[PDB]
């Protein structure tokens, strides 16, 4: 999950250096942070949303 | 001589041209016209040129070898690591000032003692880089002190082991052996890969050398790194490290020709036109 | 971990055309912490086999140097275009049309004329001047390069290391390079 | 000893690193960081502090 | 690594060498 800003419009991610033995593809859709909970929390205060 | 740290000094110190000190005879026969390769270019100078050459010559300047006897010995610091690179301007004027305060009779033939000693002791190194043998034999002799010089079984196999062992410390020159802790090694290369580890592995043959899924990696990495220097008959047959080091010669004479083999596979299908990506993979399944 | 390492995998720079710095196959590795004896002794079988492999292929593929990443590949190492000499049918006559035009005849459109039985044929070099040193391609980068199983890592000597292994390392400095 | 022990370039000692996102909740709040450890650093993370 | 020590006299001030690691726990 990469955090994009309010009204931001590029995005550049980088993968620092990976051996990319069989690899797949990509797939990739936007979220929101507010629907979004957590990554790997027991928990997420900050999620006022249901 | 591009490594002699007395003609690197006269590449630092002494003039590019042909003054009549240092190049007397050189000057005095073209002042004399006595030169094969234009012979009268001495008669076509000026006065202002002509006739300096002439009292530079029937009475010659004398001059100071103290600033050069110290950079041959500065230039030869700096080429046996005994200096950084950077200290040869520190040093240098650390050691002109030494032999300006206490210059003498006796300073000044000591320096024309220690340029010639400092010509030997870079040629002495250089040499012994090339020859690469005297760091690993003293540090191989004493590895071997620690193994017992008798296995219970199979010491047929294991004293033409050993020898074989100083033959790959021998007969390549970058090659080394030290000690980190309690254990020694041997790198097969200067700053390369493949270190096996010496205390280990002889902690692993022990026991297996009259034997005829039990080995260490770096035993049979031993085992790899030994087998150009060990003939048929150093070693048994039916020995199970025998049966392996006549295994590993055959592996590194298949290798050899699968690297002639992969020249030879790969330069006929660029031209017969193939997948530079599937030419590539294709062989190596082939070969391996 | 010394018996049995993890290979140090290139990266390459496709700009300099040579390998950036060779860091260990993390992104690779097999997770036996929730394993036993009968399959974490069948994992470091295959980590060793695959080892086994990789100097196998590095045996065979990569060309025999000294030192691991040169900063200049000499022209005698490096794959280098030699195409076949280039054939070219030369169209006119050029002797034959300053007479046909010298004599009053205005000469229009385009063997190839009908007024002259002569035809040029000329072979011209099509590789380069010089051959290209300094920097392998893609296809060499995978030839050489191999990664590097690293057995006893670190064992020796500071100075008798893989310095070549670091990204920041230059060879001809022996340095660490900075921001600077 | 002189060389290989200290740095002769231009090395700061103590970093300063602004919060990159903070966020609040009534009881709590989260401060995420950069921890940018620049070439040829190392960083013992007792030095660390808050 | 002898460049990296100081030097009381001309020998390097090493440390020992099987200083390295921790062992300590909570009664242990």
Do not use: C
């Amino acid at each position: 999950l990469y955090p994009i800003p309010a009204n931001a419009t590029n995005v550049p991610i980088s993968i620092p250096s990976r051996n990319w033995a069989a690899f797949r593809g990509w797939a990739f859709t936007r979220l929101k942070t507010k629907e979004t909970p957590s990554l790997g929390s027991g928990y997420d205060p900050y999620y006022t949303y249901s | 001589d591009a490594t002699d740290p007395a003609v690197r000094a006269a590449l630092q110190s002494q003039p590019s041209g042909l003054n009549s000190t240092d190049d007397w005879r050189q000057v005095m026969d073209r002042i004399m016209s006595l030169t094969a390769r234009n012979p009268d270019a001495f008669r076509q100078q000026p006065q202002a040129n002509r006739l300096s050459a002439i009292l530079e010559a029937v009475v010659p300047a004398r001059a100071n070898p103290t600033h050069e006897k110290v950079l041959a010995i500065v230039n030869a610091l700096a080429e046996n690591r005994a200096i950084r690179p950077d200290e040869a301007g520190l040093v240098y004027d650390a050691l002109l000032q030494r032999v300006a305060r206490y210059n003498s009779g006796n300073v000044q033939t000591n320096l024309d003692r220690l340029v010639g000693d400092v010509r030997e002791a870079v040629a002495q190194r250089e040499r012994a880089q090339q020859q690469g043998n005297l760091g690993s034999m003293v540090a191989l002799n004493a590895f071997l002190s620690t193994q017992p010089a008798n296995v219970p079984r199979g010491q047929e196999d294991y004293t033409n082991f050993v020898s074989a062992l100083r033959l790959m410390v021998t007969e390549t020159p970058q090659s080394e052996v030290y000690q980190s802790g309690p254990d020694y090694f041997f790198q097969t290369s200067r700053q390369g890969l493949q270190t096996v580890n010496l205390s280990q592995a002889f902690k692993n043959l022990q026991g297996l050398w009259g034997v005829r899924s039990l080995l260490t990696p770096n035993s049979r990495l031993l085992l790899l790194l030994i087998a150009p220097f060990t003939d048929s008959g150093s070693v048994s047959r039916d020995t199970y490290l025998g049966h392996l080091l006549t295994l590993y010669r055959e592996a590194i004479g298949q290798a050899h020709v699968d690297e002639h083999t992969f020249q030879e596979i790969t330069s006929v299908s660029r031209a017969l036109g193939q997948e530079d990506t599937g030419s590539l993979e294709a062989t190596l399944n082939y070969l391996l | 971990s010394k018996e049995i390492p993890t290979p140090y995998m290139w990266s390459y720079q496709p700009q300099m055309g040579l390998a950036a710095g060779a860091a260990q196959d993390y992104s690779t590795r097999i997770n036996y912490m929730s394993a036993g004896p009968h399959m974490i002794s069948r994992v470091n079988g295959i980590r060793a086999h695959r080892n086994r492999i990789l100097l196998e292929q590095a045996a065979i593929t990569t060309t025999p140097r000294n030192n691991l990443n040169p900063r200049s590949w000499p022209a005698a190492l490096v794959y280098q275009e030699s195409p076949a000499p280039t054939t070219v049918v030369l169209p006119r006559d050029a002797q034959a049309e300053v007479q046909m035009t010298n004599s009053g005849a205005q000469l229009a459109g385009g063997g190839r004329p009908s007024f002259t039985p002569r035809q040029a044929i000329l072979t011209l070099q099509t590789s380069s001047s010089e051959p290209r040193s300094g920097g392998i391609g893609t296809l060499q980068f995978i030839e050489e390069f191999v990664p590097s199983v690293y057995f006893n890592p670190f064992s020796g000597p500071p100075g008798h290391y893989p310095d070549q292994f670091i990204p920041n390392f230059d060879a001809v400095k022996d340095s660490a390079d900075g921001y600077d | 000893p002189t060389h290989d022990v200290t740095t002769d370039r231009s090395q700061r000692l103590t970093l300063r690193f602004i919060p990159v996102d903070r966020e609040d909740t009534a009881y709590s709040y989260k401060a995420r960081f950069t921890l940018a450890v620049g070439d040829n650093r190392v960083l013992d993370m007792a030095s660390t502090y808050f | 690594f002898a460049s990296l020590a100081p030097r009381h006299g001309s020998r390097p001030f090493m440390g020992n060498w099987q200083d390295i690691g921790t062992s300590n726990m909570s009664g242990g």
